PDB file of C-alpha atoms in Angstrom:
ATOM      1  CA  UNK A  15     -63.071   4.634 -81.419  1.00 35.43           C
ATOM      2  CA  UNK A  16     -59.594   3.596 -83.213  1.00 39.08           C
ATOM      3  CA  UNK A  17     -57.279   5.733 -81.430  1.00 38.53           C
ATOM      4  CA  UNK A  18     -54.989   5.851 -84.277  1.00 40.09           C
ATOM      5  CA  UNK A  19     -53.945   7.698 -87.754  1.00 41.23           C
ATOM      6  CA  UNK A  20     -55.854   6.229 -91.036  1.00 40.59           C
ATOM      7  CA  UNK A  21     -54.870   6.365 -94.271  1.00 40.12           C
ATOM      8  CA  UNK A  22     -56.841   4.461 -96.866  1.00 42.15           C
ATOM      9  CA  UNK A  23     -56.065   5.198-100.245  1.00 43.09           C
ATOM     10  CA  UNK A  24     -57.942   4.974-103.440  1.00 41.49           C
ATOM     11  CA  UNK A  25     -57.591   6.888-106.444  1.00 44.20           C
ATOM     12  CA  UNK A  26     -60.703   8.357-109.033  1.00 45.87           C
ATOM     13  CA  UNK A  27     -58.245   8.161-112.177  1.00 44.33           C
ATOM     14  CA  UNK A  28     -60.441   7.124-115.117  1.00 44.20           C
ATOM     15  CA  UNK A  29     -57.669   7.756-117.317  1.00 43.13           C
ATOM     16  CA  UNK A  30     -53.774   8.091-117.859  1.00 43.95           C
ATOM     17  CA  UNK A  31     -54.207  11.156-117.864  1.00 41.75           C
ATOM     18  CA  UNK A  32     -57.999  11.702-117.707  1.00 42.05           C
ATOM     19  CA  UNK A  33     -60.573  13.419-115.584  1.00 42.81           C
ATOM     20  CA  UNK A  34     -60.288  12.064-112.308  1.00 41.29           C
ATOM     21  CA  UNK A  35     -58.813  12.713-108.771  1.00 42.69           C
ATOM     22  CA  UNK A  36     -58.191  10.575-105.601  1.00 43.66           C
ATOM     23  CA  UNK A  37     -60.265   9.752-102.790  1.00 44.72           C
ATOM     24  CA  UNK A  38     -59.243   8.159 -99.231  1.00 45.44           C
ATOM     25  CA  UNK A  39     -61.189   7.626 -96.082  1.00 44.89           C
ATOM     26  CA  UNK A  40     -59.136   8.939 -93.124  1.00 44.97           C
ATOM     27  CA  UNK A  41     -59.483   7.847 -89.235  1.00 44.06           C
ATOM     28  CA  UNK A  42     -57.968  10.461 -86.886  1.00 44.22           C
ATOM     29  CA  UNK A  43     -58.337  11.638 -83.470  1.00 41.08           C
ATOM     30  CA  UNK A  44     -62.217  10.308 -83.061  1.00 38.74           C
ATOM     31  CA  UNK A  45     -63.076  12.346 -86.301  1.00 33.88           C
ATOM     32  CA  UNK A  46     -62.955  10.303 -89.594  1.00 34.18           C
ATOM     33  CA  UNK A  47     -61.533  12.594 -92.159  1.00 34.61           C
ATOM     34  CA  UNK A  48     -62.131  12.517 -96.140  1.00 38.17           C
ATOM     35  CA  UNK A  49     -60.129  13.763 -98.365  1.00 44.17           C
ATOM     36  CA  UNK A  50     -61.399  13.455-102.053  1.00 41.32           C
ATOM     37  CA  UNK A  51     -60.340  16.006-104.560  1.00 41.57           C
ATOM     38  CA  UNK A  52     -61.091  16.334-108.263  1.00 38.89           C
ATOM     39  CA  UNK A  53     -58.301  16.786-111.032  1.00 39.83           C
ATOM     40  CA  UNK A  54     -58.888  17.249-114.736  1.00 38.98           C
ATOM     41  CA  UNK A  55     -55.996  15.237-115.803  1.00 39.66           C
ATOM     42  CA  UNK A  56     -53.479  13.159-113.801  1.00 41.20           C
ATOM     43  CA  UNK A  57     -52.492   9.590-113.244  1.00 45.69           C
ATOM     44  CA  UNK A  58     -53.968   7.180-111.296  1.00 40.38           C
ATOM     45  CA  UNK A  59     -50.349   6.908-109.807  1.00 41.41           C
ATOM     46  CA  UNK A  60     -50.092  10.140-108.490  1.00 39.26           C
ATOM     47  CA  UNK A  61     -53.316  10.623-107.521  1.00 40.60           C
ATOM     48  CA  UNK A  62     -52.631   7.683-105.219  1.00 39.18           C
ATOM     49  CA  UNK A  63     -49.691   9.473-103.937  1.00 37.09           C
ATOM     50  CA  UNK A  64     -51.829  12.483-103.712  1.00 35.32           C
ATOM     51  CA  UNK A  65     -54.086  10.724-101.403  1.00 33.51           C
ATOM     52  CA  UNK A  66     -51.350   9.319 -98.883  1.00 33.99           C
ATOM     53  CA  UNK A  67     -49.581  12.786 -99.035  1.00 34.70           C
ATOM     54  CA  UNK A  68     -52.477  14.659 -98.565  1.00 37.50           C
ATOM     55  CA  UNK A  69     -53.310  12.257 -95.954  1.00 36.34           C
ATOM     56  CA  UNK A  70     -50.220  12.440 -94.074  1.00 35.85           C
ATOM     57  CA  UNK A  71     -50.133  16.860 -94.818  1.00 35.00           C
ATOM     58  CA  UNK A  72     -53.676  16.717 -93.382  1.00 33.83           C
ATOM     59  CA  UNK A  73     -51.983  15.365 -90.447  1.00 32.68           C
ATOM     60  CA  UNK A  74     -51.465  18.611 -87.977  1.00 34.48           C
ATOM     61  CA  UNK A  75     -48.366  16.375 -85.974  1.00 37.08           C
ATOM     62  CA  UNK A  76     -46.338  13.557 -87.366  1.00 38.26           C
ATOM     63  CA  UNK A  77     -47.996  10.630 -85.490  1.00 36.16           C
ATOM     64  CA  UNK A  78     -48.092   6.627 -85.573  1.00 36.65           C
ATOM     65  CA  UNK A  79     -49.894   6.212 -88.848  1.00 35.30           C
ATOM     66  CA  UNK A  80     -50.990   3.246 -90.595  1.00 36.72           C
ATOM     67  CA  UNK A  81     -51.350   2.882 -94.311  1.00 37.59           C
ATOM     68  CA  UNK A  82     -53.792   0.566 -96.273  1.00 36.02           C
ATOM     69  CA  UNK A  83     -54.056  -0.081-100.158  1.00 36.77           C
ATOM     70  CA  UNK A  84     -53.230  -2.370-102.514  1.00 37.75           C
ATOM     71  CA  UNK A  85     -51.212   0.060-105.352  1.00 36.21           C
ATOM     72  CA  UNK A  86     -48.433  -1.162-107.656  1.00 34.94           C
ATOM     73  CA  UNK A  87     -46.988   2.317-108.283  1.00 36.10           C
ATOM     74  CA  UNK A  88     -46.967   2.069-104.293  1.00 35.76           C
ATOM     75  CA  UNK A  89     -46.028  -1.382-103.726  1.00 35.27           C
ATOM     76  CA  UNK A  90     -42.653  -1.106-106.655  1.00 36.27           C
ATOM     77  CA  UNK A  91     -42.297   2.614-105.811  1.00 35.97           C
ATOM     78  CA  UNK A  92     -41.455   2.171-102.317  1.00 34.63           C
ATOM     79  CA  UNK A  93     -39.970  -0.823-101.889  1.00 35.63           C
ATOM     80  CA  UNK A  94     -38.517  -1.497-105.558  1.00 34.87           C
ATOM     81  CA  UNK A  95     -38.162   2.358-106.847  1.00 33.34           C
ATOM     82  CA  UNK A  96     -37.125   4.330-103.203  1.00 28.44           C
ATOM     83  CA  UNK A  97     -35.159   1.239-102.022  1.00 27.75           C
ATOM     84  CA  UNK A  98     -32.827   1.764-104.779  1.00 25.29           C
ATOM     85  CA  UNK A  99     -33.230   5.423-105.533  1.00 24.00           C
ATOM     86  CA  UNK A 100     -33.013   6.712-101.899  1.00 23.85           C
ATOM     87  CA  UNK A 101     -30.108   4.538-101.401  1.00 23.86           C
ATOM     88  CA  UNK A 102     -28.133   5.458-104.615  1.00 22.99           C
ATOM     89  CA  UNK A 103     -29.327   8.976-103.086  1.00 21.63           C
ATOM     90  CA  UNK A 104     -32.337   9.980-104.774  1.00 24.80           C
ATOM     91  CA  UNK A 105     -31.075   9.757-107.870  1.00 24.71           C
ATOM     92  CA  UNK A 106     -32.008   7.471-111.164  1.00 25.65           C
ATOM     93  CA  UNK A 107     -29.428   5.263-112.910  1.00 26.62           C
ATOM     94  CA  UNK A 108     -28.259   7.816-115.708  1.00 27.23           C
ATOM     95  CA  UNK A 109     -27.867  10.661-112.865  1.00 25.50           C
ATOM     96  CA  UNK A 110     -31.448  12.584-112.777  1.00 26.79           C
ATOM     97  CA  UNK A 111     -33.979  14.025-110.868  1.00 29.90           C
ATOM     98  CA  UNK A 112     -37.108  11.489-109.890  1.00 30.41           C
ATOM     99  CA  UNK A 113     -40.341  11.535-111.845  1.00 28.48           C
ATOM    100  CA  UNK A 114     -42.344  13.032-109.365  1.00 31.94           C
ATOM    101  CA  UNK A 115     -39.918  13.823-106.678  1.00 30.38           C
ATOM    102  CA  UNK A 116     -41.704  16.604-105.242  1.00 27.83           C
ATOM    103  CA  UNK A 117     -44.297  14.207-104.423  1.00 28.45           C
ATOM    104  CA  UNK A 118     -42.409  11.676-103.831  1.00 28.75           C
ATOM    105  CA  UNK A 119     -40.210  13.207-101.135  1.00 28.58           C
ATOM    106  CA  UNK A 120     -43.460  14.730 -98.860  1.00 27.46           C
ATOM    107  CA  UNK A 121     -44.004  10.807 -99.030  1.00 30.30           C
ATOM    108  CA  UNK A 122     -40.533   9.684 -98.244  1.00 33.10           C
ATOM    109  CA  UNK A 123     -39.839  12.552 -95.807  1.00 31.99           C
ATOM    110  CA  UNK A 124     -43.210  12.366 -93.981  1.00 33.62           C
ATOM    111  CA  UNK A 125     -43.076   8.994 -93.437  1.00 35.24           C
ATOM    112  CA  UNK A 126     -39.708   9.632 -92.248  1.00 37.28           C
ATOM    113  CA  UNK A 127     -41.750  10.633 -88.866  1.00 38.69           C
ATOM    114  CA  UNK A 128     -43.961   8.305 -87.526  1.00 40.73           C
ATOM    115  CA  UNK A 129     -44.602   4.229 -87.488  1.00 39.29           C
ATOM    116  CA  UNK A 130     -46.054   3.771 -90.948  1.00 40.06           C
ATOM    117  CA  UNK A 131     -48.066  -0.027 -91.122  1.00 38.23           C
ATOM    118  CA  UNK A 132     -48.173  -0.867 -94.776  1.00 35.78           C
ATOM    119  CA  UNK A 133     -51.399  -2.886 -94.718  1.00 38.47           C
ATOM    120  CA  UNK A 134     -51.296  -4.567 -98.228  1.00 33.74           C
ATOM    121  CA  UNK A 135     -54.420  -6.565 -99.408  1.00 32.32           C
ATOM    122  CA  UNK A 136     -54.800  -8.584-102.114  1.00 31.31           C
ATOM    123  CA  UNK A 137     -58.225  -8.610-104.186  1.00 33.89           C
ATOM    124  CA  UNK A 138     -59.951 -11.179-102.275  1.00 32.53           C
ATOM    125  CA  UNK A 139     -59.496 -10.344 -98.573  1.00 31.28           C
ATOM    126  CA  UNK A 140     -60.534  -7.339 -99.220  1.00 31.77           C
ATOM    127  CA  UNK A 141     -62.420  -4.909 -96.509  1.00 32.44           C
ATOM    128  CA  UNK A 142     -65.234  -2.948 -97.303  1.00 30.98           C
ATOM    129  CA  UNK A 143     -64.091   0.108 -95.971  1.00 32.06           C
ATOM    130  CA  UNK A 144     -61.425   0.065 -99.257  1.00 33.28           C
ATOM    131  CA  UNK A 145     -64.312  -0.114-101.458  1.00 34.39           C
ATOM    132  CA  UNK A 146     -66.161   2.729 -99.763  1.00 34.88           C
ATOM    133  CA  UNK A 147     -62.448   4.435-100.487  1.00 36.37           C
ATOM    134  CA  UNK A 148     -63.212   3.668-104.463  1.00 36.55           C
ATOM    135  CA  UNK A 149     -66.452   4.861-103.913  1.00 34.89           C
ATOM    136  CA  UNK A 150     -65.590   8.049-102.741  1.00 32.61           C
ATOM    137  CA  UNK A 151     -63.094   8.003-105.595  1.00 31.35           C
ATOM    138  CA  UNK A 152     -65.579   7.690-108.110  1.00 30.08           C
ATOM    139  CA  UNK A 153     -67.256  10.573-106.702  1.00 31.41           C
ATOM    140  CA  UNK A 154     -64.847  13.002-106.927  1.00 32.79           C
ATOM    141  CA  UNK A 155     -63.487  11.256-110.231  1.00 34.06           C
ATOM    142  CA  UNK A 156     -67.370  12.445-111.631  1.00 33.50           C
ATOM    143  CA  UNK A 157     -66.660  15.760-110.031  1.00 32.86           C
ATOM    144  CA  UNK A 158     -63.698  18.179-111.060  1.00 33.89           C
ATOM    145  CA  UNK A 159     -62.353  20.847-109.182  1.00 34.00           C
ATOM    146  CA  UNK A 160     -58.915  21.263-109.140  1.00 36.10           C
ATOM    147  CA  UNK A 161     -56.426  21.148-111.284  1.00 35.25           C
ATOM    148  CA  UNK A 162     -53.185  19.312-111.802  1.00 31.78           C
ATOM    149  CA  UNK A 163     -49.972  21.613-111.150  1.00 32.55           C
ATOM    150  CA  UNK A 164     -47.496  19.343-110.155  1.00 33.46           C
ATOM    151  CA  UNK A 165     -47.557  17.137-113.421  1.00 35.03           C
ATOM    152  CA  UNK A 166     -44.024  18.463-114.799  1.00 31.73           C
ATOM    153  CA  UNK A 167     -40.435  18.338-113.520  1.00 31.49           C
ATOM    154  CA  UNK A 168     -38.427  20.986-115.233  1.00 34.57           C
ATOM    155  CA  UNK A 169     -36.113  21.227-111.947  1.00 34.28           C
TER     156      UNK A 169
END
């Protein structure tokens, strides 16, 4: 038993935008947690974010967590896109609010909280547990029920 906060994310979007959601396979206190949704249309960006927001929201107290994936819009986003943006102050380059902020900042903010371990992985030392994560994906990208609210930013 892995006394320790989980978070491995994998999105379900088919796609951009298309009918899928995102899936991860959480590890909390000795009680693995899933947390696999189904949009109708959303990015497989966002979704990702979905899953390590929902992750960390799932969370009921702001403890040591550590993060696995292997995401681009992850990887740039945080340290590429927030490096600079947070920085500059949350802001973009022609003064303007962030494409997906409001997600963005329960990311930011909650990880503004506990030790986050960025486990990247490239795709060839690659666990099996991840592709249970796209498996779990898949199964919630081949079942819809939700729907996608926070895909505009008309601040």
């Amino acid at each position: 038993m892995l006394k320790q906060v989980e978070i491995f994310t994998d999105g379900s979007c088919l796609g951009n935008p298309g009918p899928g959601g995102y899936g991860a396979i959480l590890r909390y206190r000795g009680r693995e947690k899933t947390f696999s949704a189904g949009y109708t249309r959303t990015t497989n960006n966002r979704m990702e974010l979905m899953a390590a927001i929902v992750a960390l929201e799932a969370l009921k107290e702001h403890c040591e967590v550590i993060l696995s994936t292997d995401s681009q819009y992850v990887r740039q986003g945080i340290t590429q896109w927030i490096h600079n943006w947070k920085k500059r102050g949350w802001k973009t380059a022609d003064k303007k609010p962030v494409k997906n902020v409001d997600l963005w900042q329960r990311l930011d903010a909650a990880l503004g909280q506990h030790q986050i371990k960025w486990e990247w992985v490239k795709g060839h030392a690659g666990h099996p547990e991840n592709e249970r994560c796209d498996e779990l994906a898949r199964a919630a990208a081949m079942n819809p029920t939700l729907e996608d609210t926070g895909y505009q930013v008309e601040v």
